[PDB]
Symmetry: none
C-alpha cells in the first residue's frame, strides 16, 4: 500500500477535523489514538462520554477529551436546535417532519456528523463501522449532494493481488448502473487513482470477450467505453473483456494484440454490483494480501467515506488520512 505513504505525509502537512460518528466503538477509539500520534487529523467522536472515557481506560489509551479529541454528546448538545433545523431545511420536502428531524439529530450519529461537515464545524467524516452502507450513504447523498459535473456516485475497493494493486467498480452504491453512470464512475475511479500517484490502466469487464455476446450487460459496457473515450481520450482503457485478460497481458495479446490497454489493469469496472462485491469478497478472503483503502466513495460534494462493519483499525486510520487530503483539495 505504498500509495498510502504520500497520503500520510500530505495529511500531517495540514491536519483537518474529521467526524467519526461511532465513537463508542473499540476500533474507532484505537484509530483515534493512532491518528493523534501520527498527527494526521483532529478527531471528533460522537457518543455518550460515559461510554467513551470508560472504554478508553479499559483499552489503556492516552487520548483524553478536550485536549486530544472533541466529544459531541448525541444525547445532550447545545447545538441540537441549530442542527435539526438545518437537516429539516434540507429534507423538509423529502419526507422529514420537524419531529422526525429532531429524533434524527439525537439517535442517528451519521446525520449529526454530516450536518457538522455541512455547517463547517468539521472538514470530513468517516462512518459505516456499524450498520449497512445505504443507511449511511442515504444520509450523505441527501445532505451533501453530488459535486458539480456529476450526476452519479460510486464506491471503489482495492486489493493487493499477485498481478499488482487492483481497484473494483461501484461495489456498494449502484446495483445495475447504466452506460452513462458507468462512464462517470470510470472517470471518477481513474481520477482517484491518478491522485494516489498511480497511472490509471482501466478494464471494463464482462463474460463477453470483445463482442462475443449481445446480452444487454455486454452491450452497456461497450457503450460506456465510447463515452469514456470521448471525455478522456488520453486515458488507458479497453474492453469489454474477460477478467483473466484484464490482469494477464499474455491472455489479452492472443485475443486483441493491438489492445490500447498495456500490461495488467489496476482498475476493474464491473457491469452490476453483484459481480463487483462477490468478486471483491471472494478475492479479498482468498487472492489478496492486505487491503489498503476501501470502500472509497467518489462523487459526493463533501469529503466523506462509508465503511463496513468488518473495517479494521488500519482501514479506519487509512480512510481518515485519505479524507484529510480530500478536504485539503476537492472531494473525490
Amino acid at each position: 500500500g505504498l500509495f498510502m505513504k504520500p497520503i500520510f505525509s500530505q495529511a500531517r502537512k495540514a491536519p483537518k477535523r474529521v467526524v467519526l460518528p461511532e465513537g463508542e466503538e473499540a476500533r474507532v477509539l484505537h484509530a483515534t489514538q493512532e491518528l493523534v500520534t501520527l498527527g494526521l487529523a483532529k478527531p471528533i467522536l460522537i457518543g455518550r462520554p460515559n461510554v467513551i472515557e470508560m472504554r478508553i481506560q479499559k483499552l489503556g489509551l492516552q487520548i483524553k477529551a478536550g485536549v486530544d479529541f472533541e466529544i459531541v454528546n448525541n444525547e445532550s448538545d447545545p447545538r441540537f436546535k441549530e442542527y435539526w433545523t438545518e437537516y429539516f431545511q434540507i429534507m423538509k420536502r423529502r419526507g422529514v417532519t420537524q419531529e422526525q428531524a429532531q429524533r434524527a439529530l439525537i439517535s442517528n450519529p451519521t446525520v449529526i456528523g454530516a450536518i457538522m461537515v455541512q455547517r463547517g464545524e468539521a472538514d470530513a467524516m468517516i462512518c459505516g463501522t456499524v450498520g449497512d452502507y445505504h443507511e449511511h450513504f442515504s444520509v450523505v447523498k441527501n445532505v451533501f449532494g453530488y459535486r458539480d459535473g456529476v450526476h452519479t456516485a460510486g464506491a471503489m475497493n482495492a486489493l493487493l493481488l499477485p498481478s499488482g494493486n487492483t481497484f473494483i467498480a461501484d461495489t456498494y452504491v449502484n446495483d445495475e448502473p447504466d452506460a452513462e453512470e458507468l462512464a462517470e464512475i470510470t472517470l471518477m475511479a481513474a481520477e482517484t487513482v491518478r491522485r494516489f500517484g498511480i497511472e490509471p490502466r482501466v478494464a471494463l469487464l464482462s463474460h463477453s470477450n470483445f463482442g462475443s455476446s449481445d446480452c444487454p450487460s455486454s452491450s452497456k459496457m461497450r457503450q460506456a467505453l465510447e463515452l469514456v473515450r470521448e471525455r478522456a481520450p488520453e486515458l488507458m482503457i479497453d474492453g469489454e473483456m474477460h477478467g483473466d485478460a484484464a490482469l494477464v497481458e499474455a491472455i489479452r495479446n492472443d485475443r486483441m494484440p493491438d489492445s490500447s490497454l498495456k500490461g495488467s489493469a489496476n482498475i476493474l469496472v464491473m457491469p452490476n454490483m453483484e459481480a463487483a462485491r462477490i468478486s471483491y469478497n471472494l478475492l479479498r478472503v482468498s487472492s489478496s494480501e492486505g487491503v489498503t483503502v476501501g470502500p472509497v466513495l467518489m462523487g459526493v460534494a463533501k469529503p466523506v467515506h462509508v465503511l463496513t462493519p468488518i473495517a479494521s483499525v488500519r482501514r479506519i486510520v487509512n480512510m481518515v488520512a485519505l479524507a484529510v487530503v480530500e478536504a485539503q483539495t476537492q472531494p473525490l
Copy 2:
C-alpha cells in the same frame, strides 16, 4: 489429486469419447496421454492426413486404427445417415436439408453429437475451438435435457486457500430464474457427491441475509426455498456475501445458527456475469493448477463444452470424467 478416483474408475471400464477438434495440437497431446493411461478409447474428427502429419511433427506414438479411430469429416459412407438424422431433429428449427448437409461436413460438433446420439460413441468433449454457445446449441438441440430437468448449467472448480470450490452457472444462462437456479444447485450438489465430497452450498449476493430487496436477492431467496423442499438433507444457506460463504468466522458474526457449517465448496451465483468474472479473476490470482471445468450438467448424454484456452491436462481430466459419466449416468 481428486481426479485419481475418476481416472481409476475410468481405467476399469473405458468408453468411446469423440473429440471433434481432431487436428488441434492439444487434442492429439491429450489422445496420447488418454491411451497410455488406458482411460478412454478416443475418436478424432478431421482430415486423416492432417491428423497423421501433425502426430509426426509433434513427435507422437499414437497410430490410427490401432490406438484411436479417425472419422473423415469430408469422406465417410455414414454421411447420408447423419445429415438425415440432424435434419429430422432440426427440420422445424430453420435447418433445411441443404444446411443439414453443410452442417455434417463443416461442423465437427454436429457430426460428434449425432455419433453419441446413434450410440456409435458413448461421450463427447468439444469446445477447444470456437464459442461456448455455438457448441452448446448443437449439444442441447441434439441430446435434449435429462428427465425431470428443464435447464442446463456449467460449473468450474478452483483450489482456493479455503479448499476446493465450484462456481455456477458460468456459461449457459445469463440471468437464470429461481427455478433455473434451484435446478442448477441440485445438479451441482449431486455432481460434487460423485467426486466423493460433501456438498456445502452458499447462494451468493451483495445482499447479506435480507439486506437488499433488488430482484437479484429475492431470486436467490426464492431459489433457497425451492432447494429446501426438494433436498431437505443438502447443506445449503443464503443469500450471503462471498466472504461469509468461504470464512465461517465472518458468517457466525452475521448469522450464528446458519445450517451452512464450515466453508462452502459450491457457490451458486445470481447472473453469469457474476459467475464468470468471479471465476476468471480467482483462476489467475489464486493459481493452484487446473482440475475440472466447465462441467456441463442437465444434458441427456455425457458431454462437456470447453474453452479455446483449455490445456491438455483439462481435456484429459474432462474426458476421464465423461468416461465415468458414460458409465453410470450423465451429470
Copy 3:
C-alpha cells in the same frame, strides 16, 4: 360454377327472417327484391317507411311492405320500450344508461336488429353496408356473445387464386390474436369450409419457413399449430411456412418433404390483421376473377355477418342466403 348453389337450395326450402339494419340503402333494397324473387329469405328492413317506399319507386322495384317484406320504423314502433329495456338489461353494468339505450334503439339500426334477433322476432342479420366494421361487430358481440366453447370471433374472406378457392383469416376482428385466439380461428375456419362442402387444408403463414426466425410473431404460429393438432388431429394443417410454400407443393416438398399438408392449402391463417388485410386487398384486385362470399363472421352465438361499405348487391344476397342456413342449422 356456384358453390352458393347448395347454400341457396337449402335457404329456399325453409326461408328465414333476416334483419337488414341499412333498410334505406339502394343496394339493400335491390338485394331484398332479388331475395324475394329467388324466395331465399323473408326480409325485415329498418328505417323510415316514408323513405323506404319512396326509393322503391325511384329504383323501379316491385316489392311492397304489406307481404313481400316487413318494415320496422325506428322512429316509431310499439315494441320500443321492450327493446331498450332488453338492451339496457344486457348493458346496464357495461357503461349504458337507460337514456343512452333509448337513443340506441331509435338512431342505431344495428342495435335494433341485434335485439330483434336476440328476442327471436328474427333468425339472422346482415349489416355493415354503411360505417365501420367494429361499430357493428361490438354491438353483435355485446348482445349475442360467443358460441359455447368459443372465446373469440374471426372474419374469413374468399379469393379464386390459380390454386383454387382460397380463404384468409383473421381479416377484420382480431388485430393481433394470441396463440389461443389463432387456434380457435383455425378450427372455426376449418368447419366453415367443411360446411361449404370443401376439404379444409390449413397453412399458418409467416416470413419464417419452419423455424428460420425466432420473432415472437412466428413462435405464436408454432404454438397455435400444437394447440390445433391436439384439438383436431384429423384436420390437414402444417406451419409455420411462407405463402409460396402453402400454395405450390414443390416449393414445400423441397423444404419439408413429410409435410402433412398436400397440394395447395385453401385456408391461409395469418399472424396479424395487417398481414391479413394487406394480403387480401392486394390479391383481390390482382387475381380478380370473382368471389361470392365474405367477410364470413365466425364464433358469434347467432347467425350474423358484418360486411364492408363496398359490398355489392350479390354479396348481400349471397351472405343473406348463407345466414338463412346457419339459422336453419347452427351458427358459423
Copy 4:
C-alpha cells in the same frame, strides 16, 4: 411506358453492362444454377465472373452440365481451401470483426469455410467490383456478413430489400421483404427514398404507397401511426416525390377505389412502390402475389443501402434472375451502389 411491359426496364441495364463489364464474385461457384449463369454471363458479355469453390468439383460439374466456359479463360476460380492471399484476407476480416466476437482463429476458419466472407473481403479490397450470393442458405447468414464488411452508404443508417412483380396494373415493387422485421418510422422513411431512387434508375416514375389495414386514419395501431410518421419524414426530405398513405393495398393499386376515399390524394394512377409496416405483411403479400400472378419476375431481392454493389438472393432464385441481378450489380459497380 415500360412499367406496364415485361422486363423492358432492364434493357438499359444489359446495354450498360455490355459496354463495360465489371468483375462479379459468385461465392456458391459449385452450384449447378450458378455455373449456368456464368456461361450465359460470358456468352452475353455482361460480367467477368469470379467463382469460389474447389476447382475439381466446379470443372467436373461444368463438363457434366455441358458448359463450354473454361477456367482461367472465361472466368477465374478462387480455391476456398487454398489461396496465396489467405493471410491478407483473414487479417482484414479480423480487423473489421475483432471487437464483434471473432478471434484470429475464427477469422481464419471463416475465410476457408464461408465463401460469402471470402467474396465480401475480395470486393472490399478492390479485387472484385460486386458480389451476388445467397443462392444457398438463409438471407441473414449472408446479409450480416455484407453489412459488417461493407457498412451502410453515407447518410443511411438502415438497409432494405425490394422485390418486383408484374401485376395486372404494371411492374410493382415491395419493401422491406428481407432485412428489417419491424422497422421504425425513420427506417421506413430511409427505405422509401432508397426504393424511390432504385426505381428511378430503372427509368420508371416512382409512385409510392405506404400500406396498412388502416385506411387514412381508420385505426390508431402502433403500425398505422409509424406509417403516418414515415410519410411526414419522406415529404420533408423528398417533396418532389409522389407518395401518399397510410392506405389499403386495393386503394394503392386501383386509382378508382382511392378516388372514392381520398379524391385529392397526391398519389395519381397506380402505385408501383408498396412500402409495408412489417416483414410479415411484406413477405406473405409478395409470396402469395408472386405464385398467384401469372406474369413472371426479373429482379429480386434488390438489396439497398450497402456501401458496395451486392445482392443476397434466395435458394429458389432461377438461373435467369442470377444473370439479371449480376447485370444490375455491374451497372451498380459503374455509377454508384443501390
Copy 5:
C-alpha cells in the same frame, strides 16, 4: 356570486351560442332565460316540429325565428359545405365522405362545432346528453388546442367552508403526466383570475412533502418544478394532503416556509379517479351550490361540455361564461 360580472359582460355584447340538444326540456327552459336576461343569441339544433310541440307543452314564450334560430339536422341548405369542411378535417382521421354526410345529420355536436369553426356561431354548450368523451372527441378534433398548449382539462367548482374551491382535472385525462398537469395548473390559475379570484394552487397527494416515492407522488413533485420554472408569480405548493391544502395551521406545522398562504382555492389532482371521486363525494356532502362546471380549458374555440344531470341554471351560467369567451379569448 361571481356570475354577476360575467352575466353583466354577456348583456353588453350577446353572441351566437349553439346548443346542440335543442329537443331537450332543460335546454328549452334555459334558452328562454337567455333571451329574457338577454345573455346570448341562441341557435338550437333538432327537428323544428318537436321543438315547437315541446315549447308549448312546457309553456314557453320563445318565438322560433324571432327570439332564437332553429338549424334542422334533417334539412338545411348549408349541409353540403358542413360535411365537406368536416371531411377536410377528418379525411386522414378515418372519416369517409359517407360517414361525414351521416355525421352532419345524426351528430348535433359535430353540426354545432362546424358552425363555430365556420364563423356562423361564436360559442357552443353541449353534453346535456351522452358521455363527456363523445362530445370532447368532436370538440378536440374540429377546433384543436389553442396556441402554446398541447393539453386540455376540465375543472369543477365547490363552495367549501374555506370558500369557492376548484378541482382539476375531472373529465379529460385519466393519467395526466407531469407536463400535462403543469399545463392544466396554469390554465386553471388563469381561468380563476378571469373569475376575479387570486389563484392559490395545491398539488394534492397521499404523500406529504416527500413522504412517499410511488410514481404518482413523484409525478406531482415533477409537475410543481415545471410550474415554478414557467410561472414564478403563481402562489403554488405541493405535493401535500387535502387538509394541508385547506387549513393554514396543518400546513404550517409540516411546511412553515410554504409559499401557499391561507386555504388553496385550486386543488390539482394526480388522476381522474382521485379527482372525480373527491368532487362527487364533496358535491353531495359540501352541499351549498356552485354556478360553474365542468369548465373546459385548452381548446381553440369557446366550447364547454356539461353532464346529462346538469341543471337549467348551469346551462345558462356556462352559456353566459361562453359568451364572455366569445368576446376576449377562449379559456
Copy 6:
C-alpha cells in the same frame, strides 16, 4: 341509532373496556397528547397504560401539564435507554428479522432507539395486550415494524386502514387509506370483508360501495375492472353482505342518484363503507371531507389484518382520538383483533 349520530356507536366499546381493562403500550410516551390521553384513560378506567421514553423527561411534563397520573402508580414507564429485559428483546427481534436485513448489532440499536419495536416485542411476548402508536412521524414507519413482528391474521394476506367521517348521510367509513397504494382485486376483496366485519362490530349494518370514476362500465381503466373483479370475489365470499359497484361517490351516498342510473342495485339507501381503487383517491377524498364537514371524527385510522390488537395513528391525532382508539384496541384484546 348507531348510524346517523355523533359517537353513539362508540358507547359499547367504553362499556366493554371498563369491564376488563387491558395493558396498552404507548411508544410515544414523551408526547403531551399521549400524556393527556394517559390521564383520561386512568380517570375513565379504560386501560392500564404502559408508556415508553426517558422517565426523567416524562415526569417533568406530567407536571408542566399539571396532571395527577404518577409513574409506577397510575401507569408504568419502560425506559428505552435502560431495561432489564433488553437482551431477550433484541434477541426476539433478531429471530424475526435476521433473514430480513437486520444484524444483532442493528437489532440492539433498535430496541433502544425505536419505541414501536420495543412496543411490538412487548405485545408479541404477552407482557402487553395491545399497542397505539404513530402519534409522530410517517404511517409506514410504524406499520412496517407492526407487520414484521405480528404478521397477518389467519386466512388474511393483506392489511387495510379505515377512517370514519360523520357526513350528512351518516357515519361513513373509507378504505384503504394508508397501507396499499394500488391494491389488486384480491386485496380490495379482503379489505372490503375486513371493513364490513369492523362496521358490524360497531353494531352498524354494513352497506358497501366500490367507487370509481366509471359509473357501472362508463370506463375500461385497469382500475374499473379491478373494482368489478373485486365485486365478484366479495359476492362469492360473502353473499350476506350488501355491496354494489363500480359507481360514482354521489350514487354511493344518495339513493335518488343511484336509482336513476341503476334502478335495481343490491345497495339500498346510503353507503356507510366507501372502498377506494387506490390510496391516492382514498386519502385525498377523506382529507378534503374531514375538513369540509362540520361534524367531528371519532375513530381512524382503524388498522385491519394484523394478528395483534394494534393501530397506527397520524401526527394530527387529537387527545380524544387516541383515547377512543385505545378503547377499541382494549376490546380487540378482550376479543379478537380486527
